[PDB]
Design a protein around this nucleic acid. Structure first.
Lengths: 204, 154
RNA sequence: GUGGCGAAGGCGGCUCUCUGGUCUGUAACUGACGCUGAGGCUCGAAAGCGUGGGGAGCAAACAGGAUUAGAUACCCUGGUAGUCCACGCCGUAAACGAUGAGUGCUAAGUGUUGGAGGGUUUCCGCCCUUCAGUGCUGCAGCAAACGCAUUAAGCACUCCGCCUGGGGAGUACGACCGCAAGGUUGAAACUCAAAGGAAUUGACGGGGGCCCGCACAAGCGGUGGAGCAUGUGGUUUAAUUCGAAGCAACGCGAAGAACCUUACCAGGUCUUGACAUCCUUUGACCACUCUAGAGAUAGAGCUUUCCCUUCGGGGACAAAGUGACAGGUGGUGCAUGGUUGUCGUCAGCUCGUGUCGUGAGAUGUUGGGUUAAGUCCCGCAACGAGCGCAACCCUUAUUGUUAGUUGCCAUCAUUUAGUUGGGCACUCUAGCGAGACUGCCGGUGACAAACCGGAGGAAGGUGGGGAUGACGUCAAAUCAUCAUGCCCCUUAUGACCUGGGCUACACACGUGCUACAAUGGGAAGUACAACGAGUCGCUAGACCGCGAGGUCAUGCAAAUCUCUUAAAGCUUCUCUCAGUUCGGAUUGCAGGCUGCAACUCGCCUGCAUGAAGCCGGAAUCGCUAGUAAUCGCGGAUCAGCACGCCGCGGUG
């Protein structure tokens, strides 16, 4: 184990906290409420492909904003699903909530999206050598300085584990002003678990 | 080291006598970084020197240093599995190093009731060609100028 | 002497006798008389055999001493055949240039052995030509590559010997030879699908060279000896829960074992369940009081009681049913994800276009110098590029400006005082900028990179320290943080309670603390920091107690108040080299504090007692400057509990 988390090395330097509120003497409750929130809304995320979520909060209201790639399939027909999101989140937080949904542009240039998609092929009995290759091919065409992928575990649904990935372009890791992205997902085909990691360099 | 020779660690001449040798003597008496105690000890010792059958603490101290410092030291070496010893010359800084070292070591082992009653007495005994410090010098000179036998072509 | 001679085996002190071959010049002579050679004969290292001599040194066999798990070996002390001569026999060697003999033809350069010619001519020492030997380098051509190359492994003709996958096997049978040992000749049955030559990239070597690093050397202080704290082995136990095992396990998981934590043990208990979903009856569940009990639980008492209504429903919930189901710190780190250690912050790991090679492949990335550096320069079939290195980030050393409260007090009055009037000058706090770049000056060096010296400046050559850890190595560590494939349990390996281990002690190993004193012990006085923490928390002040502490009370959610007058230091007065006015283990008695409760098993106080220990063998550790050595302060965890851990500053 010999590498630092690339978006924890850079937090507080060129990127911000995904949770921006200041509180004292009400800090444990707020942190676990955020954890509960974020661990809940992985319900719709199972289909709607959400990437981040930003929690702010005021006197007694909680301002939420989620980045997705499916705006209509997450808000409803005329607004009949955000209604449910709010009326469900009120049952947990006991407060007023106000989701302000963002929409993501160029979704193939996002670490969680890419890695979670190319970790759904592995479950459908797909060979890994071309999943990663087509992933970096469709990540370079969007225009990116570099990308690197890596899968691990019992490959092919076979015996003793190994690891291998593929690189395209430069991905400098030691440069602090680099604005790299990163995510780690999981999946199974039928044997144990696999780990997929993905890094994308998008200039600085 | 391996790269090459290094510097010489400049010293700060003490302000009382304006003599860097007294500075090194204070630095050798001091233990655990308690320097004011070492300074009090050296100054009481010099007061004792001048008060009792003395002329000036710098003069008799220099003469004692001159009578103690060595001029021929040997070095026990290894060649290929058999070890011997050979004499060699002695560069100047090592000389005063050894002198101070011996004087302090053999004043510390005297057996009176104060480090001053030991230091003043020992460097007086030294400025008159006496004391285990001078005998240590002569042991060294006798080891050398004898063990030159298996040193003549080293 | 990569000197000479011999067909080969072989031949080295000197003199004589007998004798074989080669080379060079000449041009008297003969006139193709030549080359090769199955079968046959002759010779043939060392060992061995026979007969008779000789025998100093060496030395199979053998004896004795060692070493090792063993040593019928290697090493040491001895020691017989043999090694030597004459005469017979044997007929084999990596008997090798692993290259049969004869003959002609095909570039050059350079050594040496034996001759013959021409010149200059003391040429007898020099230049040129020319025969025959013996070596080195190199072209055409040849070769699978290695390589060979007028001394062919080239181009050609003549004659002889020999080969046809690896084992079985140079074996069996027959035959000739030999005193013997053995030699020469020489199969098959059966069995395998390979066995080989040469070169390529890696990995290893009890192979070599260069370099670097508190790795040795120069030093300063330790560990090992003594008492105590703590972890581990071992033994013990009803249980002493589980994990870690050279460096890279052993003050490690544990940043808090009296109950809890808690997995372990002994007794007392439950079974759709301590915890989750579903479906139905349905639906608002409680808490509180009293007896029995070690509690877990059971038995009785006021009662869990519609919060949506269009008269028609939905949220919380007890029991029951009801079975789907739950539950596992049970196994497998050698089935896995994730997260770490170590080589090591060492300097490496690859690609594109070219060129080289029959081909796998190479080059670049090798060489000189320099550098902390695959960091730079010069040269070079290479020219460029990517991740690594360095930079961008943090803190510390100097200062301009903006802002002066809760910070500060220089020019003024005032008190106990920076306090109150006043001010933001100074210090300080914290946002934004400056400043360090071999940037100038001299020398060295291929003028190059780089190194040595100077100026100026707070700082000079990555100024000091941190974060940052490539491709890979050890099937390294962890199913017990968490997840998870397969296996296992299910009225028990699940679950609830009290009490006991985890702290046991003939011992062995690691990491620490306190000392063995005068550079010290005791009594009185006087000083100087920084990082941090605080609401049911940090406690000002006054009083009571010898003390640890207690009571009444005060400010502060914090540059405002408190924790917090730091300890080594300095100045006086003592004590006198002793097992002591050193040391503070162990035990007796009396208290305090937290907690429902300190017996097993807490921390602290006082009086009494006063052990070992007088600087520690072999061996072994840390450290290159505000560092080592030494001295205190804070806080995470936490009712309470630190010699451990993380930080801070003082002397140096």
């Amino acid at each position: 184990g010999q590498k630092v988390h690339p978006i924890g090395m850079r937090v507080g330097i060129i990127r911000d906290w995904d949770a921006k509120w200041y509180a004292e003497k009400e800090y444990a409750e707020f942190l676990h409420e955020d954890l509960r929130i974020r661990k809940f809304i992985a319900t719709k995320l199972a289909d709607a492909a959400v990437s981040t979520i930003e929690i702010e909060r005021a006197a007694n209201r909680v301002n939420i904003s989620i980045h997705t790639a499916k705006p209509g399939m997450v808000i409803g027909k005329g607004g009949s699903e955000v209604e449910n999101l709010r009326k469900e989140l009120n049952k947990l937080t006991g407060k007023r909530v106000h989701i302000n949904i963002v929409e993501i542009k160029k979704p193939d240039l996002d670490a969680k999206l890419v890695g979670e998609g190319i970790a759904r092929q592995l479950e459908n009995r797909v060979a890994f050598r071309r999943a990663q290759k087509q992933a970096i091919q469709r990540a370079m065409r969007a225009g990116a300085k570099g990308i690197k992928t890596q899968v691990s575990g019992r490959l092919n649904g076979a015996d003793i584990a190994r690891s291998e990935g593929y690189s395209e372009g430069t991905v400098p890791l030691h440069t602090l002003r680099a604005d790299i992205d990163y995510a780690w997902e999981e999946a199974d085909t039928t044997y144990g678990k696999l780990g997929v990691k993905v890094w994308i360099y998008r200039g600085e | 080291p391996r790269k090459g020779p290094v510097a010489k660690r400049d010293v700060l001449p003490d302000p009382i006598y304006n003599s860097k040798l007294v500075t090194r003597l204070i630095n050798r008496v001091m233990v655990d970084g308690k320097r004011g105690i070492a300074a009090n000890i050296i100054y009481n010792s010099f007061d004792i020197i001048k008060e009792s059958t003395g002329n000036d603490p710098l003069e008799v101290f220099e003469q004692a240093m001159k009578n103690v410092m060595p001029v021929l030291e040997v070095k026990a070496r290894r060649v290929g599995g058999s070890n011997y010893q050979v004499p060699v010359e002695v560069r100047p800084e090592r000389r005063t190093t050894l002198g101070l070292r011996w004087v302090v070591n053999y004043a510390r082992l005297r057996g009176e009731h104060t480090m001053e009653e030991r230091l003043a007495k020992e460097i007086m005994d030294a400025a008159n060609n006496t004391g285990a410090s001078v005998k240590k010098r002569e042991d060294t000179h006798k080891m050398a100028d004898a063990n030159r036998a298996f040193a003549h072509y080293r």
